[PDB]
Amino acid sequence: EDFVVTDRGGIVENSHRVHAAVVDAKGRLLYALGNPTRMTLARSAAKPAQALAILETEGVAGYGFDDADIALMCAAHSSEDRHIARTRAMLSKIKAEEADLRCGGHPSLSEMVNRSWIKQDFIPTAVCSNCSGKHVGMLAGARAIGAGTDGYHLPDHPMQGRVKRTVAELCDLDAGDVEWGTDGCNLPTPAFPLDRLGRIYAKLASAADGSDAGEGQSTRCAALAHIFRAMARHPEMVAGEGRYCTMLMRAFDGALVGKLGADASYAIGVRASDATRQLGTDGALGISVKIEDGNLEMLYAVVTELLERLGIGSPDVRSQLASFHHPQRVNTMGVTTGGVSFPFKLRG
Amino acid sequence: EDFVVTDRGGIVENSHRVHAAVVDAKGRLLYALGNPTRMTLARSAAKPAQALAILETEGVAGYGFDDADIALMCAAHSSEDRHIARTRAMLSKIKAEEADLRCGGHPSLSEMVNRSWIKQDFIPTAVCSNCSGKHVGMLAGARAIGAGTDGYHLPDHPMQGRVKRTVAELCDLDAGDVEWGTDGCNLPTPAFPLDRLGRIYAKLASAADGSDAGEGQSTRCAALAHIFRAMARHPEMVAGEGRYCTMLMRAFDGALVGKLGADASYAIGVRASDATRQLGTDGALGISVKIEDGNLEMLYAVVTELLERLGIGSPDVRSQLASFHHPQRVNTMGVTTGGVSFPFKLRGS
Ligand SMILES: [Zn+2]
Ligand SMILES: [Zn+2]
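ok -> structure tokens follow
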């Protein structure tokens, strides 16, 4: 019975089923909407796990990827010129070429960018892929271990072996409880219970907390903390101008990281704060969300509403997101015709 | 309940709740999915009832609207140049101007038309509205009874009083059982049980059957028959090139009319046929569908699946709709990554 709803003049137009998990740094379930263990394709929200697989590949350190490169590895970017430029710069660092990519072009995730492409009849290529940074990192990993760069995207390649292991490990799942399909960018892509997506991001944030504190860290926790700080420092690489993820991460100014998955999943890693303590946990927090029918506009409204209900942020921080929280319903003559409502109830 | 489901490598991606009603010519429920009486905003799918109100307005006959004009009154067109052109020619027939329209421009319902507008930096205006034909019809009726064109779109104008009474009468509902919001084109827009949307379209097809067969008809049934005929004859006016509605109606070549409502409603009126007799009725049939979350891609897939389940059309006729039936699920490198499935059973009365 957990829904987000749009109305016209009080009459229900559409309704969308919501699933959400709120977990602690061990993955213990604190709050939920809908079915918080729903088997769910993480899509682009898996990218911090895939970036960890890259950064844990021996020899990748020698290429000198910077924080903005790492953020782009974690990106579903808008294919802005700066994303394309950074993709080529990362290819140059590993002495590869666009022709070595195994992802393909697609209409930009930004409406404003895609409008400019349409105006020019532009044909996007591999380098414009929203996943281009993850693909450059996977090439780098393939080149670093000496495996061969053709086939780096294939499930029998050792780089995909590393990804599959790393995802199960962060999720704390046996390999048999993670399912695999193929993504738009033509990499294997994982599916696992929705709460475990929150667990991954809770572990990002927890690692960021330990790094910031000066605590001793395993090589994996060090790398997670690096991923968090890269995303939070360069949120415009993770998505782009006007994008929810970018506006979300700039508003919060290092307190959390957040990421979209295609077909309306979302994941947030919250560093330990007054808010998380108020929720009843002594460490970092993870949040995962899926809109059952895949509608992105409703995803962003639900994620902002959930941050409000969880007390994360302040009204002024969250207010930067106001156009997503309450999407505009204006007709062709400027008349408001209805709006969005949140008939769901968090359960503990 | 009843879902259309999309997968990626067999892993469930999205699922969409389906509502559908199959009704006979008197509105008796024959088959259903979901909640067949769901209160639903009919949106553009109510436009034949709005057309009926226009055509029943005293004196509208004197403008000489033709079959393609009536089709455009029933349309959610793609704002192709011919749709705009017919809108202006209809303004001319009633001696009105673009400045009289109270609908506004919007991005074209056709991705291909919208590509050309972006390239040309084109800003759509009132004459480009997908509802433009409806709005010229309502100007016409307003002027035909001397009620004035100013405010023709407002609930207190007698043309809108005529629309509201007419919607309830076609649905066979009391006035309080129809709810009203405001549409994207800035007209009043009705909400009523989904099966009643099927009833409107069954009444369309039924009247066309009666008209073809030479039966005595009231002015209203004669007018429903003209509406069906105008839509079936000019499916390109009702939508446009490449649009589901147009391709559907062309494939069936007069046997049915079909129309989209925004946020994924759909309605079909089916003329009496071997298919409909096999479904247990002696007359015409009406179908209405709503995808709960509003997804258009899923709507067209479900409607086409539902035609196959009902045996409506030859399997050869329906293969013209294959690309809508099972939408493409291929990635940026040409690899098929998933599909759509229909794990529901149509429940019969
Ligand atoms: Zn990808
Ligand atoms: Zn309209």
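The pocket of zinc ion (ligand 1) is lined by residues A 131, 134, 183, 185, 187 (CB under 6 Å).
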